[PDB]
Paper text:
Members of the solute carrier 17 (SLC17) family catalyze the coupled transport of anions driven by a proton electrochemical gradient ΔμH+ (= Δψ − 2.3× (RT/F) × ΔpH, where R is the gas constant, T is temperature, and F is Faraday’s constant), with contributions from both electrical potential Δψ and proton gradient ΔpH (pHo/pHi). The D-galactonate transporter (DgoT) gene lies within an operon devoted to the metabolism of D-galactonate, suggesting a role in transport of this acidic sugar. Two 6-helix bundles (N- and C-terminal domains) are related by a pseudo 2-fold symmetry axis perpendicular to the membrane plane.
We were able to crystallize E133Q DgoT with D-galactonate bound. At pH 9.0, this complex crystallized in an outward-facing conformation, in a different crystal form than for the WT protein alone, and refined to an R-factor/Rfree of 28.5%/30.0% at 3.5 Å resolution. As with the inward-open conformation, 2 essentially identical monomers (rmsd of 0.63 Å between their 345 Cα atoms) pack in pairs closely against each other sharing contacts from the lipophilic surface but in an antiparallel arrangement in the asymmetric unit (i.e., one molecule with its cytoplasmic side up packs against another with its cytoplasmic side down in a noncrystallographic 2-fold orientation). The structure includes residues 24 to 443 except for the 11–amino acid dynamic region in the cytoplasmic loop (residues 231–243) and 13–amino acid periplasmic end of TM7 (residues 276–291). In the outward-facing structure, Arg47 (TM1) forms a direct electrostatic interaction with the carboxyl group in D-galactonate through a 3.6 Å salt bridge. Four residues (Asn393, Gln264, serine-370 [Ser370], and Gln164) provide 8 hydrogen bonds with the 5 substrate −OH groups and confer high specificity. Preventing access to the cytoplasmic side, TM4 and TM10 form major interhelical contacts in the outward-facing state. Aromatic residues Phe137 in TM4 and tryptophan-373 (Trp373) in TM10 both make hydrophobic interactions with the aliphatic surface of D-galactonate. In the outward-facing conformation, TM4 has a kink at Pro135, whereas TM10 is continuous.
Residue numbers in the entry: 24 to 230, 243 to 289, 295 to 442
The structure:
């Protein structure tokens, strides 16, 4: 009865966020064959992984500027059709230099995925259901990064390894042109409902660099929010890049690739829904999403307790609970669109994950730096410290709705 096509764009985004995260972990799937063919060393492989991580964060502040400058639609086509071509060409790469360069190119076009979807969902879902929308396409990340990894392995072992980059890259190419022709602003869309467009707008859904603005974006209210995701997105990047299973593996654990990614799946899902229901009630817009972020980041510190047993106990349960707190508090960016000024929606989205994605580059490096000289115990307290620092820095500098 009410507007129904508004969620169509949400599904297309969910599809995009899935495809975007498949091209993130497709390299890890083939990482057991890429080293052997080119004769690459373990250290050199790190360049291939790092190539995507670095440019992904560095190419957000240009993307944030590129998003507002060029628009919200064409940017995603250039993005989807951008990285999808790089990934496709990676299947025909000759030498690690071709892989490092292409993975760099892949990170460039895939960087403006976070700010572009945010404005896209904010121009279509700036209401109470933005958290349910934010908690919807984020689940596709945990699903798209994992639930498709077995299918890649199936295509990897039976057929050649190149098809993993042709499938993931080829699907993205088709999806860009598909998405390019179907999605468009609400008024300019073919079928617009008289009630939906007003329904979308009643919540706030609408279609050079200044020195002053340059210093204002780095404000206390946004700074405390920037630091918040530095502790949220980081925990997800261990699983993406550096450390699924590396050193000291006999007395680390013993199935591990699906447990935390479900707890976060429903974690982001219900958390986006809990904040969604709370906000429509007599609670503030920030407090409805702030609350599940604080306790979540507090739940994220639950992993510190896994070392008290050192015995084949139910660590996996509290492991999923600790990862549930990150997912439950994974809608930390659902409010960045609100606090950010109307003029600079793209830049804030970049500088935002520029702290979160950076967390995916520095936090994994810290956990590794102490595991050789010390062990895993200082790594669990650090993740809890970053989560506590994330929570602590949030509750103090949250500053509600600026
Ligand atoms: O790519 C992205 O959207 C960001 O990394 C981040 O928003 C996601 O990883 C998730 O929402 C939080 O970890």
């Amino acid at each position: 009865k009410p507007g129904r096509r508004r969620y169509l764009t949400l599904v297309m985004i969910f599809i995009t966020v899935v495809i975007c995260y498949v091209d993130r972990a497709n390299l890890a799937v083939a990482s057991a064959h890429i080293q052997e063919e080119f004769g690459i060393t373990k250290a050199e492989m790190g360049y291939v992984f790092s190539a995507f991580a670095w440019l992904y964060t560095l190419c957000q502040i240009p993307g944030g500027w590129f998003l507002d400058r060029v628009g919200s639609r064409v940017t995603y086509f250039i993005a989807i059709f951008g990285w999808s071509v790089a990934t496709l060409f990676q299947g025909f790469a000759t030498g690690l230099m071709s892989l490092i360069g292409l993975r760099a190119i892949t990170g460039i076009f895939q960087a403006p995925a976070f700010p572009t979807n945010n404005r896209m969902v904010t121009s279509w879902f700036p209401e109470h259901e933005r958290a349910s929308a934010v908690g919807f396409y984020t689940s596709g990340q945990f699903v798209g990064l994992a639930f498709l990894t077995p299918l890649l392995i199936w295509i990897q072992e039976m057929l050649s390894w190149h098809w993993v980059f042709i499938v993931t890259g080829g699907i993205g190419i088709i999806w860009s042109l598909i998405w390019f022709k179907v999605y468009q602003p609400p008024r300019l869309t073919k079928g617009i409902s008289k009630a939906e467009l007003d329904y979308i707008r009643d919540g706030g859904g609408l279609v050079p660099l200044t020195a002053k603005d340059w210093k204002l974006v780095f404000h206390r209210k946004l700074i405390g929010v920037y630091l918040g995701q530095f502790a949220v997105a980081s925990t997800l990047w261990f699983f993406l890049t550096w450390f699924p299973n590396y050193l000291t593996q006999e007395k680390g654990i013993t199935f591990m690739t699906t447990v935390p990614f479900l707890a976060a799946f429903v974690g982001v899902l219900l958390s986006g829904w809990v904040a969604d229901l709370l906000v429509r009630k007599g609670f503030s817009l920030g407090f409805a999403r702030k609350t599940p972020i604080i306790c979540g980041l507090l739940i994220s510190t639950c992993i510190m307790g896994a070392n008290y047993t050192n015995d084949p106990m139910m660590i996996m349960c509290l492991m999923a609970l600790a990862f549930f707190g990150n997912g439950f508090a994974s809608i930390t960016w659902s409010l960045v669109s609100s606090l950010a000024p109307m003029r600079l929606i793209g830049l804030t989205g970049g500088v935002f994950n520029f702290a979160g994605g950076l967390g995916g580059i520095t936090v994994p490096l810290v956990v590794g730096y102490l595991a050789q000289g010390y062990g895993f115990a200082p790594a669990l307290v650090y993740i809890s410290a970053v989560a506590l620092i994330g929570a602590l820095s949030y509750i103090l500098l949250v500053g509600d709705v600026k």
